Structures are given as structure tokens and as C-alpha cells.
Amino acid sequence: ASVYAWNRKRISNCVADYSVLYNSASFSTFKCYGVSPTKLNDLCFTNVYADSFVIRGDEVRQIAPGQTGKIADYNYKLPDDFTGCVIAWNSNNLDSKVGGNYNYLYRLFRKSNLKPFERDISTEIYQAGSTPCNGVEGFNCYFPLQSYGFQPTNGVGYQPYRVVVLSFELLHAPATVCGPKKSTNLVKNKCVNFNFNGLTGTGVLTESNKKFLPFQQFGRDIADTTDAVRDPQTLEILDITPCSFGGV
Amino acid sequence: STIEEQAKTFLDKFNHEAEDLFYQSSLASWNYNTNITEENVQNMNNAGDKWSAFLKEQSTLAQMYPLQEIQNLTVKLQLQALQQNGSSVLSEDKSKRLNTILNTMSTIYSTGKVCNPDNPQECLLLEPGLNEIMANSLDYNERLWAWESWRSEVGKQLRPLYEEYVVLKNEMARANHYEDYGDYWRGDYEVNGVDGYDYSRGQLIEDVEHTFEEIKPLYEHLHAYVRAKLMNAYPSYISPIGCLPAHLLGDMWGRFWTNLYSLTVPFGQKPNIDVTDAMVDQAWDAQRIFKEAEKFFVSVGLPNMTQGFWENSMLTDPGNVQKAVCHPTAWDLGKGDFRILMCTKVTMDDFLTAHHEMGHIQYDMAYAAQPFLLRNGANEGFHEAVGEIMSLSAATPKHLKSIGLLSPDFQEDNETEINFLLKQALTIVGTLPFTYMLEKWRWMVFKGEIPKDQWMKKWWEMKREIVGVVEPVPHDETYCDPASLFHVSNDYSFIRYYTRTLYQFQFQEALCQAAKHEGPLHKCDISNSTEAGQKLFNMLRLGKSEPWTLALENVVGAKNMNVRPLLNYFEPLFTWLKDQNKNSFVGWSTDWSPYAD
Ligand SMILES: *[C@@H]1O[C@H](CO)[C@@H](O[C@@H]2O[C@H](CO)[C@@H](O)[C@H](O)[C@H]2NC(C)=O)[C@H](O)[C@H]1NC(C)=O
């Protein structure tokens, strides 16, 4: 969609794999504000707002925290305390066509600057002077939107550029967006330090004979000591025995 | 509220609108040129009319926004360029009369035909008939007959048309607070409001006069040697002391003396600089030409060029289903659209012409970030110079050897260098006095100082004193030979060629200095030189926002016009001409004429 009508998507209750986009190596711009891309991968966020639109290359700098401009102030404004990142890539092969891809628009004219994280889709003719527009364009009255001009021959500052802004959120609401929790291989019959979804126990894991219930996750003993855990991956039960120890 | 902010917002929005509409108009022109069809011509005409109407409306709407209280230099320059209404400064009737006169003059020049007296039914036009005859046939009688017929069938018709066109141009120039149309044209080079770079219209005139004065000995020696070779070819047609014939200059108006290189070659046995044999043996084509040119672009530091041009623009003649213009054109369409339209063949000449055209195109992307009103050169002699410096550098034997066109076993002796220098002088140096005199003549013709009843009597006089060329047939005021030229017959400034030549010589010298070149300037090649490309792009990207004097200072360090690069380039040729002309008369005599014995 147009930048003044930026597509807002709510990302939550899902695993957000930032590694694939961090290492796809095909995007012109990847700017992370407030947190490095690697560290946010192993971090949990309550929500993500994904604002996707198309702007020009020169306007790419406009889409950044603490920036002012036509796109920054009349189409999409970012708060200074930005948490997510911004990913932009050339769309000349897609969003640029022979004759001019004029479908896209941007709010060139507006009566006031946009509030951060606000979208303006007003189509009323902006009144430059004191002369009323009377519902039509003319003197002191112009359309608030200018059509984007995209052609395959355009330069870096004039080619189409799809921009996706991933703002991260973590607040009193329960955290939803987390990266892929890395899982290592499985070992057995060896005193190892394990962690199954937060158990963080240490011992020797052996093949179990007891049968859990499908809703159940891990067993327990009379002394309230963990003694059997079901694998979060392939469904099987393992008895955890304490590491061999004694006196000498 | 205030004029400043409202004018700036209007400037931005109508700059976007004008960029879009100019792109549409140039796209219609490109469609017409690639395929000459009735729908294509109609699209061309409609797009041109819409663009002109919207440009006039935007110019008027900017006119009601005063520039008195606007202090932004770029905004002021853009709005002043818009305010240059030109022919519309007069009444609607006067503008329509001027348009009709210009159209009639252009149509007469283009459709002008010459018919042999023996065969009245057989008639030939100027192009390609007259040009081919005058560049190939060496017969004095046939060349003189073609000269007289072309300058009579068109000159007599165009004389009233040219006179009324000049009168109208003076009228609008006076309505534009200019002394004459020459002043209006020179106002493009004028710089105002810039500290340390202001340029006046008379400054250009005096600089051109001084440059021609310091070039005079070299041109005199070159003309003397060409004349001597001409008696060597025409013993009984040209006096050793008298001036050269007008029709024996190679072309119709004497613009190019390259056609005389066959008869004025320093050595007709030594081979010339040409790699077309190896070029066609290497299975090269137009695609190979363009790829090698792009490789040369990226070799000098210039960035890789967009694939949109490759997937949009045409290279060779698109068969016979549709007709494409073979004239080399570099279309800076707009909205970042850049295309090239030429009939590219497997030849060295087409190689150099294509190199020139992608030089134009790269200069077009150079000022892409500038606004539409600033999306052009500072003057009319920059883009052609930018293309020609690259074309000449690629024409050097070093570039051909690097790209495989010339074998490394090739020997570079003084004979080939002298032949190439003389060929360039006939192509380049020969046209400088002619361009200078023609532009000056048009300047006082617009000024009206020279009485009309002896205008021709003035022209041939300056054909003798300046060019050193005497007409073979005397022409009265009925003849309008200067208007027989395409530029005069189509409202084109002619000083652009001389200015572009001097600019390109300066640019070549600057690029050679940046490339740490050692030796003759003609063998200098900017290939594989990042510093030269960067220095060129320092002025390429500036566009027309900065004064042209600022660009010249950035490139070569000379604020005003310079001829030192020309002297450095042609010093071997100057020495050779001085050595060869020691046994022949130097200069020319105005009194002698072919029609007087
Ligand atoms: C996690 O995903 C893997 C996908 O491979 C699932 O493991 C597969 O389970 C089948 C069951 O027969 C085996 O044949 C494959 O060899 C397993 N692949 C592996 C271990 O890489 C596993 O079931 C999933 N865990 C769940 C759903 O809890």
C-alpha cells in the first residue's frame, strides 16, 4: 500500500525468526534501533507492529527515529524511542514498471505533521491560502497526495523501495514474540547439565518405562524432586537420576 | 501565508508534476522515433502540446510569486528560468507569426531540392544526396553547381523569412529587456547573484574574441597547409595566396573540413588509426560496443549503469517492420529515464558515437537528484563535451589495445600522430573560426547594427578575413547562405559548438592531469583512471545549480575560457604545420576570388 496508508500488521503468538532476514543478504537497508539484531533474536517481546509500504530511496532516511521530512512528517512518523528495526530493499523489478508505476502515492501536502505511529488517509484538498477549495483543485488548493513515479531506469534515490518497520513491544501484557529457542542434540546415560523448557536440572537422562499423560510434561517424586521429563521435541519420557556421588 | 514557504511548496509540487509530464513527452518522442507511425506522431504532438501548456501555466503561476524577497539561490535560479517566457512575451498574433515563419523556414530547409539542368525531373535533397556528393565528388564544376543551387533555391526563399524572423526575435528581445536575440541567447551563460562567479553576456563575447585571437596563428598555418594540398589537388582552381573556395571545404557551409582529409592527408601511404578490421574479426556488434563502453565506464570509477536502459533502449536497426531514426540521440526523458537511439553498426565511428551517447546519458544520471528545472547542464556546451572527451579517450590506441581492438604489436610513430592530429583539426579546429564568425554574424544581425542592404557584403568579408575562405560565386542580398545552415534555419545557437570544443579540450587536459598522463595529449587515455573519473563526476553531479564558471574552476582551475589545453593537444601538429608551411604563403588574401582572374 501507499506510505500514507502504510500496512500495519500485528505479529504476536508466533516465533519470529530474525536470522533468516539477517542473513538473507539481499536488502539495501537494515537498521536496528535500540537493540542489535543478534541479541533481539534471543529475546521475547509482547508484540510487533510491522508497517510495510513503498517509498523512494531518498525517503528511506526519512523512515527512521528522530527524522523529519515529507514522508517522516506527513506519511509515517517514528517515535525517538524506537525499539524494532527497519528493513528496506529495492523493488525496481517489482514496484517499477515501464511508463511509471503511478499507483503508489505519498502525502506530499498536509496541514500538520503526523503524530508518531499515526496514519493519515484524508483525501480532502489541502487549502494553501484563504481561498476555499469548494471540493475541487485550483488556486491555493492542491491534492494532499502525489503519485509515486517508479520506472526500471530510476536511480538509487528514485527507484521504488519497499520498507518494513518492525517495532517491538514488551509491557505488562504477556510476552508473545520470541525468536527460535535454539535446541541442541540429546544425550543419554551421561551426567549432563540439562534444561528442558526451564527445568534447568542436572543429572543422567535414561530411557524411561513409565507412561505420562499427553497433557503432562514432567514427573515428580514423593519428595517433590523432578525424576522424569518428557522431551519437548519427539514425545518420549526420560528418567533423570542424580549425578553419581558419594564419600571417599 | 508568506511568499517564501508557499512558493517553496509550490516549487516542489510543480517540479514533481513537470518532471512527470516531461518524462511523458520525451517518452512519446522516443516512441515516435523508434517506430514512425501515425499514432506515434499523434502521441508526440499531444504530449508536446500538453507539456508546453502546463509549462506555461506553471511559469505564469511562478511569475505571480515574486523573486524580490526569495533568497534561495537554487529556488531563485529555477524561478528565473521559468520566468524566461521568450517568444510569449509578445502578443498572440506576433507569437503565431514567429511560429509560422520558423516552421516555414525549417520546412524549406529540410525539403529543399536541387535539380540538374540536364534532367529537371531528377532532383536531390540536401541529405543524404548533397552531403554525400560534397564529401565524395572532388569535381570543381559539380561541387560549384551544387553549392550555387543549394544556396539559391533555399537562400532566396529563406531571405525574407530569415529577415522577418530576425525582426521578430529583436522585438521579443527588446520586450524581454534585451538588446537583441543574441543577448537573450547569451543570457544563458550569464550568472547573477553568485559571489566570485558572476558572468556577463559581453564577457563571453570578449573571451571568445580573445581565444580566437590567440588561436589565430595555428588556424592560419592549418589553413595554409590545407590550401597547399588543395593546389596539390587543384593546381588551376585556387591561388597560393588567395582564400579557399567555399565549396572546396568538404561540406556545404564549410562546417567540417574532415572530407578534405583525403586530399590534405600529410602522408597518403601511412596507415590511419583504425581497428575496424580487428573489430569485425573479433565478432563484435552493438551489444559488444555497449558492454565495452560500460566496462570503460566502470574502469574510470563511474558506477555501473542501470539495467532499465538495457531492457528498454534499442541498439541496432529494428529490422524493416518499423522505421527508427538513425541519428544518434541521447534521450534524458525524465523521472530517471535515460535512453539511447541510434543505428549502431560494427564500425569504429559508430563505436565512438555510441561512447559519446552513453557519455551524454551518464551525465544525465549525474544530475538526476537535482530538481527538474536544475536537471540540465549549466550551459549548452557541457553534455556534448562530456561525451566527446570520453569518445576521444576511447579512440586512443591505448584503449583499443586494452580492449583488444588494437594489437600490442602496433607501432606508434610520429606519422600516425600527425595524421590523427590533422584529421582532428579538420574535424575540430577547422570549425572553430567558422563557428565563431557565424555566431558573431548572427549576433550583429539580431543587433541590427549592420545595414541589411550589404549584409552579404559583410558576410563574405568575414569569410575572407576570419575563415580565409572566399566564395566561388558572388552572392547579393537575395542569397541567404547563412540561413541555409540547419542551425540558422531551425533557431539553434551556434556558439554551443565552439564553447563545447573548448570545454572538452579543458576537460581532456584535466582528466589527463588527474590520470598522471605523460606524453602527447592525443595519445592520453583516461581508461583505468579513477581520479579522472572522480574529477569529471565532481562537475557531472553538480548539474546547472552551480555557475558554469564554478564548474570550469572545479574541473581545470580556470574560471573563464582557456585555450592552453588546445595548445597542449595540438603542439605536435602546430610544429609540423610550421615546418611544412615554411615554403608556402602563410595566411590569406581577401582580394583574390575564384570568379576574378
Ligand atoms: C519437532 O520437529 C521434528 C521434525 O523433524 C519432529 O521429529 C521427527 O519425528 C519423526 C517421527 O517419526 C521422526 O521420524 C523424525 O526423524 C524426526 N525428525 C527429527 C528428530 O529431526 C518432532 O516430532 C517435532 N517435535 C514435536 C512435534 O514435539
Author numbering:
A (entry chain B): 348 to 595
B (entry chain A): 19 to 614, 641
What is written in the article reporting this PDB entry?
We describe the development of a biologic that takes advantage of the proximity of the N-terminus of bound ACE2 to the three-fold symmetry axis of the spike protein to create an ultrapotent, trivalent ACE2 entry antagonist. Therefore, we sought trimeric scaffolds to fuse three ACE2 moieties and leverage the inherent symmetry of the spike trimer to maximize avidity. Thus, we determined a trimeric antagonist fused to the N-terminus of ACE2 would require a short peptide linker and would be less likely to form inter-spike interactions. The collagen VIII trimerization domain is significantly larger than the collagen XVIII domain (44.7 kDa and 19.3 kDa, respectively), but more importantly, previous studies reported that collagen VIII melts at ~45 °C66, whereas the collagen XVIII domain melts at ~85 °C (vide infra). Given these observations, the smaller, more thermally stable collagen XVIII trimerization domain was advanced to develop the trimeric antagonist.
Next, variable lengths of glycine-serine peptide linkers (0, 1, 3, 5, 18 amino acids) were tested to bridge the trimerization domain and ACE2 domains. To simplify the nomenclature, we refer to these constructs as TXA, where ‘T’ indicates the collagen XVIII trimerization domain, ‘X’ refers to the number of residues in the linker, and ‘A’ refers to ACE2. Analysis of the other complexes, both with longer (5 and 18 amino acids) and shorter (“zero” amino acids) linker lengths, was conducted to better understand the role of the linker with respect to the symmetry of the trimeric antagonist. Notably, we did not observe discernible density for the collagen XVIII trimerization domains of the longer linker length constructs (T5A or T18A), whereas we did observe clear density connecting the trimerization domain and ACE2 in the zero-linker length, T0A. We then attempted to evaluate the ‘symmetry of interaction’ between our ACE2 constructs with spike protein (T0A-S, T3A-S, T5A-S, and T18A-S; where S is the SARS-CoV-2 spike HexaPro protein) by likening the C3 symmetry to an equilateral triangle with all sides being equal length and a corresponding standard deviation between these lengths of zero (s.d. = 0). Thus, we calculated lengths (distances) and corresponding standard deviations between the Cα atoms of equivalent residues in the RBDs of the spike protein (residue D428; as determined by Fan et al.) and in each of the ACE2 domains (residue N137; arbitrarily determined residue on ACE2) (red and black dashed lines, respectively). The calculated mean distances and s.d. between spike RBD were: 41 ± 3.6 Å for T0A-S; 40 ± 1.0 Å for T3A-S; 40 ± 1.0 Å for T5A-S; and 42 ± 3.2 Å for T18A-S. Equating lower s.d. values to symmetry, we determine T3A and T5A to have higher symmetry than T0A or T18A.
